[PDB]
Scaffold this active site. Sequence first.
Site, PDB file in Angstrom:
ATOM      1  N   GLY B  18       0.827  -1.195   0.000  1.00  0.00           N
ATOM      2  CA  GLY B  18       0.000   0.000   0.000  1.00  0.00           C
ATOM      3  C   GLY B  18       0.860   1.242   0.000  1.00  0.00           C
ATOM      4  CB  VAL B  25       2.512  -0.619   4.337  1.00  0.00           C
ATOM      5  CG1 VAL B  25       1.465  -0.804   3.250  1.00  0.00           C
ATOM      6  CG2 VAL B  25       2.633  -1.879   5.184  1.00  0.00           C
ATOM      7  CG  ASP B 141      -7.981   9.461  13.703  1.00  0.00           C
ATOM      8  OD1 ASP B 141      -8.256  10.505  13.071  1.00  0.00           O
ATOM      9  OD2 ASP B 141      -7.496   8.445  13.160  1.00  0.00           O
ATOM     10  CE  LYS B 143     -11.156  11.050  10.370  1.00  0.00           C
ATOM     11  NZ  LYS B 143     -10.534  11.286  11.703  1.00  0.00           N
ATOM     12  CG  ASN B 146      -7.719   5.342  11.163  1.00  0.00           C
ATOM     13  OD1 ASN B 146      -7.379   5.354   9.980  1.00  0.00           O
ATOM     14  ND2 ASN B 146      -7.582   6.396  11.958  1.00  0.00           N
ATOM     15  CG  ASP B 159      -4.067   6.728  11.674  1.00  0.00           C
ATOM     16  OD1 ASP B 159      -3.006   6.909  11.040  1.00  0.00           O
ATOM     17  OD2 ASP B 159      -4.901   7.635  11.875  1.00  0.00           O
ATOM     18  CB  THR B 178     -12.978  13.915   8.738  1.00  0.00           C
ATOM     19  OG1 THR B 178     -11.829  13.248   8.203  1.00  0.00           O
ATOM     20  CG2 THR B 178     -13.945  14.213   7.604  1.00  0.00           C
TER      21      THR B 178
END
Lengths: 49, 376, 995
Positions: B18, B25, B141, B143, B146, B159, B178
Amino acid sequence: IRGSRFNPILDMLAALKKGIIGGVKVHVDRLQTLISGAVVEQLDFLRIS
Amino acid sequence: SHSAQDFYENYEPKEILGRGVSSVVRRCIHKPTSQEYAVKVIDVTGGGSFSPEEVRELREATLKEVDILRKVSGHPNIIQLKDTYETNTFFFLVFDLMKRGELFDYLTEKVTLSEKETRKIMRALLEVICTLHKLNIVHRDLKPENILLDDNMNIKLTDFGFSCQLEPGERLREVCGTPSYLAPEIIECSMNEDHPGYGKEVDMWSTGVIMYTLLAGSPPFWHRKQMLMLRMIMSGNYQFGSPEWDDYSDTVKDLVSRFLVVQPQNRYTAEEALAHPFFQQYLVEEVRHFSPRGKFKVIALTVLASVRIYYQYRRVKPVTREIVIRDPYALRPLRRLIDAYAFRIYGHWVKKGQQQNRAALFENTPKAVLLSLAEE
Amino acid sequence: SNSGVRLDGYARLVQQTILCHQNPVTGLLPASYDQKDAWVRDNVYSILAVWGLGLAYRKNADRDEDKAKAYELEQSVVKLMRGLLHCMIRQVDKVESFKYSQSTKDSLHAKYNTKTCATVVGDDQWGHLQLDATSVYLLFLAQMTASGLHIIHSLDEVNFIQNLVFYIEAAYKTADFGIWERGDKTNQGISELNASSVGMAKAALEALDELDLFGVKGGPQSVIHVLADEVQHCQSILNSLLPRASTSKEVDASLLSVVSFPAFAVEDSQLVELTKQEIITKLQGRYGCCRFLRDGYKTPKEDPNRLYYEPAELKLFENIECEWPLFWTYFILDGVFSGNAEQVQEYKEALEAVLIKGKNGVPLLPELYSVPPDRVDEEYQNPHTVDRVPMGKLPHMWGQSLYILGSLMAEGFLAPGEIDPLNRRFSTVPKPDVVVQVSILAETEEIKTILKDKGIYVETIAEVYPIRVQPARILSHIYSSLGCNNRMKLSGRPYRHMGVLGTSKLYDIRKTIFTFTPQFIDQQQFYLALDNKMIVEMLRTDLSYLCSRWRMTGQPTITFPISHSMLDEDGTSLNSSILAALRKMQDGYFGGARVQTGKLSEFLTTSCCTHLSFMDPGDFKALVLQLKETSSLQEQADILYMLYTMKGPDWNTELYNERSATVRELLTELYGKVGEIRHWGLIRYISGILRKKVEALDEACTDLLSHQKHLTVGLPPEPREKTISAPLPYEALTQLIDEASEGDMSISILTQEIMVYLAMYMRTQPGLFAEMFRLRIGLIIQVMATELAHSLRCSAEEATEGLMNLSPSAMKNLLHHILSGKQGQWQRRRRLDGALNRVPVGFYQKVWKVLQKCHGLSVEGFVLPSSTTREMTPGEIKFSVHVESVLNRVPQPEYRQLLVEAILVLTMLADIEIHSIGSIIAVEKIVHIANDLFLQEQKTLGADDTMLAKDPASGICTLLYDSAPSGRFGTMTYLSKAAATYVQEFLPHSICAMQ
């Protein structure tokens, strides 16, 4: 090789690869090519015995 | 922070798995045991385009991240940091290899999910959140991007770049993440400096939002304009679509309403959420004792269920091709097939960012002259 | 002893089978039957059994009789080898002609004659193009020489072999008729690429890397020198197209030979088991296996008296492919070779049942078994059930010799290590990694001081007087002299570009050390080397490429001189990217490889060195005045172009009274002034005047074509638009692109640049090219101009001017942006989709399934008959071509997208009902009905007339284009309602839909 003693053997192998060792000509190659096309001496006494 | 020679002679990189904004990664192997792993290579120099204050702050951030993830290690549903290597230009962070991608591609491929897997993922997320809050650590965080999935449907949080310790008695006044996942408290911090601060309530709001987007399939709040989206969030008038949630239970909808509360104090905690009847289950027990009224009530409930099961079976309608001529959206199979086909036709315009989202594909609004009235 | 009896029996069998028709004097066996011909491949393959039995005799002889037998067999082998070599050497002129350009007319004959070594047919009566036979011939020649057996006598034949090496070295981009001498899938032979030829060629090129033909008693010039770039290119090509034999055949059973005993050239063994399982599950029969699906050879139909198959192979060649036990007898050898024994027993038992006994009771292998002419209908319903009968020629020496060798190998008299002295059985052994060495040099003292200022210690071009550095083109001019003979009219190796794999290794020329810089730092060829970002990018990809394979011994060595153009504007410091790259390959990690820096003195003791021996000594005056007095680069370019086109292709301008200044000289001098200002406004303009060509363009084109892809050069419309469905030579490609671009000149350069961009892009990320079947450079160019105009809100001319002024990094970035895909919103995206016609992944399959249950799909007069479904299969290309052509009649992209949506809603709606429409369907009528329903609903709601607008030439509301597909108000619901209404309109008053 035993660590730091690995240098003189490198020098000797490099000299051997070069072709001359103290005024003596030398040849290096694989064993299969050398053994092929060469006279081999026979020991056949063991079969009779 | 050992020398790079150890990493060079211990791990051998492999093909790319990725890509990211500034990191990629790669797959790696452990020579002594031949165990697969995933390594995150971070270029602190940023290809030499970073002024040295930027390099210093990135290094400080990654050091804070490693020393905050050191303590959390131990939970089965969290990412495991196996090895760390540091250089003047690169950081090598070795985690477990998962197998597949995170929730975004799964939800895009499957359009919408059912309650069976929803119960498990929500239970695991609530357990992780409760454990994190017990350790006096916040994340801010959550989301869907993650959370990674395994071959056996296992989720672990990752993350933590925005996670930080919270001293008791403190109230943070920082804004990040976000905007669609921003709780009203954070935005109130944005407009007004007099507000004291926020806490775990933003975490509950994020959990409610991700639950909403996995259930309905579209985010509860979204608009083409940021200001109108913020006003939409401030109003707190989320609505339920009519021909969308007519086949869902009342308990799940009640839990939906309970997660999303404007008042921070009235918002439910992880422990309170875990006690909801939605997660109720039984294994074995033989201490059920009550009055004869209890026996009559239980026998009446059994008879009522036995009667109602046949009538609920009988309530099915045929294909009604004439109704298909009038309106195909009413039938659930027609709706699901139309949705899936629309997704596969237009599947490569859903990515990260507020500019493009899943809600941009569905148009439940009655496109007409009413579109003239948008805002002030 | 038992071994003596078994070997005597095998010798008797071989003598009675093969050696009875050895045909001495010429030494070439007839190609079986009463044909009176000699095929090269069969002749090469017919000697393996004799060679193996001779080697078995040699080791155990110990007696005069067996020694004499081995001597006789060996001399028969060398006699046949020399006889076959005479056929090749008698035709040097065709080899010399083929060395330049590629064509069938200057190709070697495939069927040689008996005594006097003459020709039997001309150049237009047979397929004279088979790289596989020549490659396999050289491979067994190399194995034969390595075994210790003399074939070569004169040194001229060494030059001929060197020339033939260049003759076959271009097999990865040269189309051939094939092993079966039948061209592509159908007849009317069209030359096309196959994996078997390149798979055979790779091993042959690998074998002769250093093997001397003079044995242990050779001389300074006795070794055939080969490159390494071609081998890796062939490996990449075979890896890309391993699962399928070609673009027309789903599978050919001849892939077994590539992935078995002869010429092991394959990696990632998982693909080996995959292809073995696929061939087993698809081509296995009852008494043999088939070459490939739908071959009519030797069939009770087809009128065997006639050739050039008529396009009517609907069912006349289905499930009646006869058999071929040769692939069966390959399996026993493949199993017995490495480690498998039970499969060997199973295959031996299976093959013993299909054997036939002839005279004297000896094994005989039939060619094929033919289906009886009467029991044909039963096989169509019950495949592989009806018995077959032997038919055709059956002194098949190829399979018989292969089976004899397999049996001899299984008996244990010979070891697997004797058949291949070069140890080709260990190609599946993984290699961990390699370490790359990089040296940095400074051009002048100022650059050395600048690098030393930042802490980088480098050394200038001087002070290393024993070591010299030169570009790669001089090295190519040097290599253009290998194997040159004047008496035999041999011109040596033709000029070609070098890969970075060849320049890395050190060289020795007349007791001197030479190092050559990589070819991508050449500013005299193209201008993409003027950008630092791309310099960095190609460094990264080239370091990765070297670190990946590096199949040579010793560590690599890369020289990266730092140039004056690599400094900043003020010329007192290097660019930030260059310094970052330097700091990056310091500390031993850059790109995807380990990089170690130092000095050439230390790298000298540990680096591969090549000793080279063949370079050892044996009013226009008014216009000229106006040009001289005027200024500005614009008018400069205009006047130079006008003078060049009108009277100055090579005429002297007489601008300077002492030196004759030619137009070309002034144009090439203008480059020095253009490069300093970094003005991408006329550099491409002057490059078009000089008509510079990018190197390795053919490699990029063949890489594009190898991905089952069709290229197309030129703006619409037909007929000036072209279609490059096959690889073409460099000159033909340049002429074609020039003709397509016409006089717009810059279009050719832009097409070359975008082609090169795709070229380095698909290798890294071969995932964004999905949902695409055909690319057009011109369409992409117009889309680029439209997107830039929309972004800048300017006119088309301003958009073109901005696009042509962008740095190349900008073109790469914008190409990547639009390839990723990242009112006014929905309509724009629909327009983009219609331009790029991104049809779904399973579109053609659904279209075929729908066509199965209808008479056709009419689109504005043009109709697609349902009879196409039985003469064609979804997997092949022609159906996709026809479907796109039918869908491309309409020019408007929005129309094609709505047509795709409507036909797809037809596909989904057809599944619910179980009926046959028995009528033709008009998609446009469905679209109009859906539009009318949408308009009526909007009018019913109460919308004012302004929003229900009408496009100037559509009849379709723009709000329909703006409407999202899904939802309760989407276009999908309207399309489904219209399609259902149309279906009801042509239905016998009963739907009966259930699911």
